[PDB]
Symmetry: C3
Amino acid sequence: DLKLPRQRVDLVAPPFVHVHEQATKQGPKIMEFKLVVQEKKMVIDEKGTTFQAMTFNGSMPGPLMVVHEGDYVEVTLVNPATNTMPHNIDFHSATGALGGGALTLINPGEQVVLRWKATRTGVFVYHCAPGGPMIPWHVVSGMNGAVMVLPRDGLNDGHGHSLRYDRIYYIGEQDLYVPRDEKGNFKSYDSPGEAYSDTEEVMRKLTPTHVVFNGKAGALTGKNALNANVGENVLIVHSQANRDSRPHLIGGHGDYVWETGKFSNAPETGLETWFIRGGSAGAALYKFLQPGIYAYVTHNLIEAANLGATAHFKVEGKWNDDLMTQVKAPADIPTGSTNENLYFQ
Amino acid sequence: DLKLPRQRVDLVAPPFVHVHEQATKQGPKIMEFKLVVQEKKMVIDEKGTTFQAMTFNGSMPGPLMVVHEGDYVEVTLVNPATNTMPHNIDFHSATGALGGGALTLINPGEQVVLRWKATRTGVFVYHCAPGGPMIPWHVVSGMNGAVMVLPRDGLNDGHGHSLRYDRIYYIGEQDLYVPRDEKGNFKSYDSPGEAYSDTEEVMRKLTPTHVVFNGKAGALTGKNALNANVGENVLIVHSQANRDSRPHLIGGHGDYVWETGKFSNAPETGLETWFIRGGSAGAALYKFLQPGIYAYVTHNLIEAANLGATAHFKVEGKWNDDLMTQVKAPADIPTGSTNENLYFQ
Amino acid sequence: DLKLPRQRVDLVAPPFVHVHEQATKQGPKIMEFKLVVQEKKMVIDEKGTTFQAMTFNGSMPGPLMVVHEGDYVEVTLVNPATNTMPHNIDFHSATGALGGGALTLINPGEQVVLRWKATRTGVFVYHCAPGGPMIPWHVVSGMNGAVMVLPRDGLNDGHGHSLRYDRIYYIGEQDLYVPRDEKGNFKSYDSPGEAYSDTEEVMRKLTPTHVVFNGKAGALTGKNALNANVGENVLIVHSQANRDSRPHLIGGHGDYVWETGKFSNAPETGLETWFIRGGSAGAALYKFLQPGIYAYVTHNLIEAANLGATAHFKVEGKWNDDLMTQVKAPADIPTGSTNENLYFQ
Ligand SMILES: [Cu+2]
Ligand SMILES: [Cu+2]
Ligand SMILES: [Cu+2]
Ligand SMILES: [Cu+2]
Ligand SMILES: [Cu+2]
Ligand SMILES: [Cu+2]
């Protein structure tokens, strides 16, 4: 009855993004996606703490879906019988039935097919939402991702000029609530159900034990730093389904930032730090101007350095001494310096 | 000496709003309001927990006042002698004397009359502010509401086009700080004064025990869901006098959102989730496109589902299968499905 | 090799700001600043609680630096041998090398000279960032300030009209994490290193013990209230390097607010309360219209009244009864008043 071409999309694990066109002259299609729920224990920090997670497609965050305005998105949500709980999906991009949640509740061993029209442009959260207290628990257990609905003409600067990215990354930030024992050590559990009561108690106090990108402290540092090159315009999509965040690229800026994430609004320019409201996705474009390591953080630095929420970019290219230079390397304070006369002493 | 017509306004309890014109061709008037402080015990959650509250006009939030730009607002604040504490009022809409607080301190048995000129358009918080530590305590005990100052031409989209709402609701969100005993159960008290010391200790840790709309968990669910119809443009005013919130309409959007709440600024379009800075009111317009239940939450889902901060809309009308449809109802996973080959396993 | 004039700037302690031009017809210069790290015990509240602080130039916040777009900023960072730890500096205004942090690590007894080009307009945080867990600890110990990069034509309203301030103040807000003993009293320490382990435990819970302006509760009240006069347009720069804030001027407004702090974006008008994302600076202009005391707060009123985050302005001039007036002073409730008939009773 909807007589449009169908196109199957193969998702990829974050922070990477499946192939897509930015601008397109194709007309609306039915874009077909499959999301498979996977409940499993996962490692969430550098000390090896484990966690009873619930995911779409085995990752935290779930994968980024990319479509264009006016496409229809036909999602097969699958809940294999190796899982123990019912699940569903709420697309913040969609209109009606609790985002789809009221049409996608499935028991282990079931699947369901939801179609929603992509009438709203931007980046948007999707997440599980079974009902009642299960809603926050499934979300903070990992069941959230994002979808991007691009304008058919691609992005623009809000002032009539096209913007094109050379690279895209999806940073899903996750607040986790991990019980501790009387000795103060994180507790391990053999199933999500066994974890629940203790976890709910931590959730109620609204203070995460971990705040991570791509599912664990250190996930996007080390060998898994994000690559870029001087001159590239990089789109960084950031989502947080449950709790606020304040992204910042250390040594960079947000050249164009949609912090509320919706491309019908002009981006802000030249930001230092932006703000992702819990329950949303936002996006920032930055053209790299200097090589080296950059850290990408939430700028509650306690969260960034001590709870897990730091990623790295490794950027190749040539240093620009006009923008920044070390005029004099560290040296002993001159003996004839006069700092004892300064106003603050 | 101010020679303008006087118009008495009868307030109504939230989430409803007293009758008013959106656009008007009337000139400035003196709009007369009465607010009566009421200290009383109130029920704040579904388990029947009680709370020593302080209110304007017996409700949390206090009622929404609606005027137009250039009106004068003449408020009689009354503190009956059945109350035990002094009170005052701070209008964030007003200019001077600590919002009016420095001109309205009244003891039990007194009343005072304040007039302020509505020179600033938008939605704004009002709240009690007696002085010092009493300021946060009176506010988080319930003494806060909002006022809307409409442009005389009504709302517009920031791009020269009038916007008109068919319905308006006021959602006041309240962070509450309820002591617990050694057994972990919420404590009851016989007066606000007896509650204070234990309550201040909870306040100091900055984590509410409850986050509620219209004064209690479940207030706007059940029989008291908010009504609307497909096609109606609904204005949802949201205030929070002490603490941030991130509103979201599950299954909907914010078509036009003034998240900082001030109508001299163009609204943002097509938001998923917005942000109410503690100490402010904001507003969102949404035209309903689908019937059914919608949940309206703060999108810290722990707060929403576990601390009280969920409302419902019940929307009548006809479902639009073009926007969203269940293509296939829940069914067993096909035996010949191949999910073991998916990239994430 | 950079052949520009050099101009040495003498910094002053906050909340005051060194002398500068708003609009200028001078061309780019090399603007020379010196920042000296000082580790010392400081008093942070009205009860005399002490704290092992780390500062730039002896103050919390560090001083406001002011330059113009296209200037080069050449900073000599000095770490005297009376200090115990290494330090560095990250300018959110700068491009490359972790904001400068990767080029400025200095041991006690060393200094370094960094030059960065002021290519981005706005107010921006600067802060120490040595590496790893030392990053949040140095910041929340006090090592953060701000820099303002003005357009050469000065500020404008985003709609082609120049804005000029008569006065400028810099409000640096600081979240502090002070351990308590088993009796609940704040603990004192003899060095930052001795404080660290207990302090990190408080930091991990993400709830400050104190939230202060200009380094201590009460710093900008009393004798040190901020002065202004009716009619003056005052720029209030607000920074927070680690944690969100929601500024509000009680009895006033933000006439023009850059809450993300970047002057390539038009300001919002007529705000009640704005939002400083942790890790940023923002700015608000307000033209005073009434004399008297104003309080300037973060509008988590618990933070404002109970954790230290209130400043005052003392404004001289003549009261305007058109904007606000006490129509009737406090009086007994009339005997023939009818309040028992009101809808809420
Ligand atoms: Cu689920
Ligand atoms: Cu949601
Ligand atoms: Cu009161
Ligand atoms: Cu206020
Ligand atoms: Cu340092
Ligand atoms: Cu930083």
